[PDB]
Amino acid sequence: APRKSVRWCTISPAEAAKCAKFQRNMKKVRGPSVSCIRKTSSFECIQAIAANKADAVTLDGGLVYEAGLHPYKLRPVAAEVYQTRGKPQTRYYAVAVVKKGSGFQLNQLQGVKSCHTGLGRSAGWNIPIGTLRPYLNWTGPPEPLQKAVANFFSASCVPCADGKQYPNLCRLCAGTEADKCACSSQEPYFGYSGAFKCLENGAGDVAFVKDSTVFENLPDEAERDKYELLCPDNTRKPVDAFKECHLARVPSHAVVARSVDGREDLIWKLLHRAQEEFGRNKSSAFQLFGSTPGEQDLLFKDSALGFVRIPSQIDSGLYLGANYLTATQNLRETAAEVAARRERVVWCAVGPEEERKCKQWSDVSNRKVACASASTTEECIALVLKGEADALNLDGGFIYVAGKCGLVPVLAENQKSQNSNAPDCVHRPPEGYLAVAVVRKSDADLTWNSLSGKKSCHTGVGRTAAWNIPMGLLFNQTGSCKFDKFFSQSCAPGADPQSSLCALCVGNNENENKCMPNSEERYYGYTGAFRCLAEKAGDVAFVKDVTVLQNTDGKNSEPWAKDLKQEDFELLCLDGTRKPVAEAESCHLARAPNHAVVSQSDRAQHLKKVLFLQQDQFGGNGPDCPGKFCLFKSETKNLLFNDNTECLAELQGKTTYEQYLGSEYVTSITNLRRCSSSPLLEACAFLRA
Ligand SMILES: O=C([O-])C(=O)[O-]
Numbered sequence: 001a002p003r004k005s006v007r008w009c010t011i012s013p014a015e016a017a018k019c020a021k022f023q024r025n026m027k028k029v030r031g032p033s034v035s036c037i038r039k040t041s042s043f044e045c046i047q048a049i050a051a052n053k054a055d056a057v058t059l060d061g062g063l064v065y066e067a068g069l070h071p072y073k074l075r076p077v078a079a080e081v082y083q084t085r086g087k088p089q090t091r092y093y094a095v096a097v098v099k100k101g102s103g104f105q106l107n108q109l110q111g112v113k114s115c116h117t118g119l120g121r122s123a124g125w126n127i128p129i130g131t132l133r134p135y136l137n138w139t140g141p142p143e144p145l146q147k148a149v150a151n152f153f154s155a156s157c158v159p160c161a162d163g164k165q166y167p168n169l170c171r172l173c174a175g176t177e178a179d180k181c182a183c184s185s186q187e188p189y190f191g192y193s194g195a196f197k198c199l200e201n202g203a204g205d206v207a208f209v210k211d212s213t214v215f216e217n218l219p220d221e222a223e224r225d226k227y228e229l230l231c232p233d234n235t236r237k238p239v240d241a242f243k244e245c246h247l248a249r250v251p252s253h254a255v256v257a258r259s260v261d262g263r264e265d266l267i268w269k270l271l272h273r274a275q276e277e278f279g280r281n282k283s284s285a286f287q288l289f290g291s292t293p294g295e296q297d298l299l300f301k302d303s304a305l306g307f308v309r310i311p312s313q314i315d316s317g318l319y320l321g322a323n324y325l326t327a328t329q330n331l332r333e334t335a336a337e338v339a340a341r342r343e344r345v346v347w348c349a350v351g352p353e354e355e356r357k358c359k360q361w362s363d364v365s366n367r368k369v370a371c372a373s374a375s376t377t378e379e380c381i382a383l384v385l386k387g388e389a390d391a392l393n394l395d396g397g398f399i400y401v402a403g404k405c406g407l408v409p410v411l412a413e414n415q416k417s418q419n420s421n422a423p424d425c426v427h428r429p430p431e432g433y434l435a436v437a438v439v440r441k442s443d444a445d446l447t448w449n450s451l452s453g454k455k456s457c458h459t460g461v462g463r464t465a466a467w468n469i470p471m472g473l474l475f476n477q478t479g480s481c482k483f484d485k486f487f488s489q490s491c492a493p494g495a496d497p498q499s500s501l502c503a504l505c506v507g508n509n510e511n512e513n514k515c516m517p518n519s520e521e522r523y524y525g526y527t528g529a530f531r532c533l534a535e536k537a538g539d540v541a542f543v544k545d546v547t548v549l550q551n552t553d554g555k556n557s558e559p560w561a562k563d564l565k566q567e568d569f570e571l572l573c574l575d576g577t578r579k580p581v582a583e584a585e586s587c588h589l590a591r592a593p594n595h596a597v598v599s600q601s602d603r604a605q606h607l608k609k610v611l612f613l614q615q616d617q618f619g620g621n622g623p624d625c626p627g628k629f630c631l632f633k634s635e636t637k638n639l640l641f642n643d644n645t646e647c648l649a650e651l652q653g654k655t656t657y658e659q660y661l662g663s664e665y666v667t668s669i670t671n672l673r674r675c676s677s678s679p680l681l682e683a684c685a686f687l688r689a
C-alpha cells in the first residue's frame with residue numbers, strides 16, 4: 001500500500017543544498033518525500049538514472065536527446081513552462097547576444113572569443129554550432145566536432161568540453177584549479193547565466209543563450225541598450241526582438257525518468273505538490289523556481305511558471321520534433337549523408353507487404369525513394385513526426401489524425417473516374433467515393449433497421465467507409481458509446497484483441513496477428529472487409545461500392561473471390577430499402593474524401609515533384625508500368641495506394657485537413673471522439689499546444 005520516495009539527482013554542491021532545502025520543506029508540508037543523490041554532471045545523472053541509482057533530473061533539450069539514446073533510453077516526464085513575455089510556453093528561442101560596438105555579424109564569428117552554456121546544450125551548442133557548420137570547414141563525423149569548433153573560436157568557455165585535448169575550448173572559463181570548465185555550477189561560466197557573465201565581464205565577444213537571459217540579468221532597460229542580438233540574416237537587433245532575431249526555437253527543458261519502471265507518477269505527484277506549494281509566490285519558506293546569485297538555474301529553471309505532464313506515447317524524438325532532431329542528428333553526420341537525405345523521399349510503409357512493394361519502388365527509382373516501415377498507421381505518422389519518414393497515403397479517417405498533428409495533404413488519389421480519362425486526372429477535381437453497407441442477397445431478412453446484434457466486418461477502426469461513417473450514424477440512433485456491444489461479434493482491425501470487435505478476424509495464414517491493422521490480417525482493408533462478408537464470417541460489411549465490383553465476377557481470382565458474382569450482393573439503404581450493388585448512387589451511407597498523401601508542410605513541394613515524376617514513369621499511363629513497375633497496382637491487396645488510382649491529383653485549393661475533409665466530416669469525427677480518442681491524437685494535442 002505505501003509508495004516510496006523520488007531520488008532527485010544533483011550535479012554540484014550548491015545544487016545538492018537546494019535539493020536538501022527542497023526535501024526539508026517538502027516533508028514539513030507533509031507532501032511527497034524526496035531524496036537527493038549526488039553526481040557531478042547531468043551526463044552523470046543520465047547514467048545514474050538508467051542504472052537505477054537515481055530517478056529524475058531536469059535536462060536541456062540537447063541532453064534529453066542524449067538521454068533517450070539506446071543504453072539509457074530515458075523519457076521526458078514533465079516539461080517546464082516559461083515566460084514568453086506573453087502567453088506561457090513550453091518552447092523558447094535560442095539566441096546569440098553581443099555587446100554594442102563590436103561590429104561583426106553572424107557570418108563573421110571566426111576568430112572571436114565565445115562563451116557557451118555547456119557542451120551539448122540546445123542554444124549553448126547544438127543550435128549555434130549547427131548554424132555555423134558551414135563556416136567550420138569540417139569533414140564530418142570521423143573528425144571530432146570539437147577539434148573543429150576549437151579552431152574557429154579563438155578561445156571559449158564551453159563547460160564539459162574536453163579542455164585537455166582542446167584547451168582553447170576551456171581557456172576563457174574561470175574556476176579554481178580543477179574547478180575550471182566544470183560541467184556544473186562549479187565553473188562560474190556554466191549555463192545561461194555564466195554564458196552571460198563570461199560575456200559581460202568582457203571575457204568573450206558573443207554569448208549563446210536563451211531569449212530571456214539578458215532580461216534575467218539586466219532588469220533596467222538602460223543596462224540592456226548596451227547589448228544586441230546577432231540575427232541569422234547578418235543584421236543586429238535589440239535584445240527584445242528575439243521573436244524576429246533568433247537562431248532557433250527549441251523545446252523546453254524536461255524532467256526525464258526511465259522508460260520501464262521509472263515511477264513517472266511518483267515524480268509527477270512530487271512536482272505537482274511542489275508547484276502548488278512552492279511555485280509562483282505560493283510560499284516564502286522555500287521557493288522552487290528561485291536560486292542563489294552565486295549560482296543560478298539550480299535543480300530547475302529559475303522563474304519557470306511550472307510544469308505540464310507529458311503524455312505517455314511521447315518519447316524524446318516526438319518530444320523534440322523533426323526540426324530539432326534533424327539538426328542534432330546532423331552534427332553527427334557527414335555533409336554527404338545529410339545532403340542525401342534531404343533529396344530522397346522516405347515513404348512509410350505499413351506492415352510487411354507494403355514494405356516489399358516499397359522496396360521494389362526503391363530500386364526501380366534508383367533510390368529517389370527510400371523506405372521506412374511500421375506495423376500500424378499511427379506508427380508511420382509518428383515516424384513522419386520524428387522526421388524519419390517523409391510521407392504516406394492515408395484514408396480520410398487518418399488524414400484527420402495527421403492533420404491534428406500538423407501534417408498537410410499534399411496530393412489526392414483520383415480513381416479512374418469517369419468523364420474524360422485524358423490529362424484531366426491531375427487537375428480533375430477529386431470526386432470522393434461512396435461509402436456503403438453491403439449484405440448478401442440471400443439474407444433478405446437483414447436491413448439497416450435490423451443490424452442490431454448481427455455480425456459485422458469493418459475495414460479498420462479509424463477509417464472512413466468502415467468505422468467513421470456507420471459508427472457515426474449508429475451512435476446517433478443509439479445514443480451509446482458502447483461500440484463493441486452493438487454488433488454481436490465483429491472484425492475491425494486495430495480494436496482490442498480481447499474485445500468482440502476482434503472476434504471475427506483471422507490473422508495471417510497460420511492465423512497469428514489476429515486483428516492487426518495491416519495486411520497481415522486477411523480481413524483488414526476494403527478487400528479483407530469484403531472477404532469477411534464473403535467467407536460467411538460476417539453479416540454486414542462496410543466498404544465503398546466499388547469494392548464489390550472489383551472482387552466479383554471473376555475479376556479477383558483468389559480462391560475465395562473467383563466464383564463471386566455481383567448478383568449475390570445488395571446494399572442496405574438508409575431508409576431501410578435494399579438496392580443491388582450497382583444502385584449505390586441511390587443507396588449509400590455517405591460520400592467520403594479520397595485518400596490523400598500527407599507530409600510536413602516543409603517537404604510538400606519537393607514531395608509533390610518527386611511524386612509527379614515517379615507517377616509519370618510508373619503510373620496509370622506509366623510507360624514502364626506493366627513493364628518494370630506499376631505504382632498503382634498490387635493484385636487487389638491495395639498496397640501503398642488503391643489499385644484503382646489513375647493518378648495523384650491536385651487538392652483544388654483544399655490544402656488543410658479541415659478544408660480537404662470538409663466541415664461535416666471533420667465535425668462528425670469530433671462528436672464520435674466523445675466516445676473515444678487515441679494516444680496519438682492525445683500526444684499531438686500537447687505537442688501542438
Ligand atoms: O540549455 C542550453 O544551453 C540552451 O538552451 O542553450
Ligand SMILES: O=C([O-])C(=O)[O-]
Nearest residue numbers: 395459463464465466
Ligand atoms: O479506408 C477505409 O476503411 C474506407 O474508406 O472505408
Ligand SMILES: [Fe+3]
Nearest residue numbers: 060061122123
Ligand atoms: Fe536550454
Ligand SMILES: [Fe+3]
Nearest residue numbers: 395396464465
Ligand atoms: Fe477510405
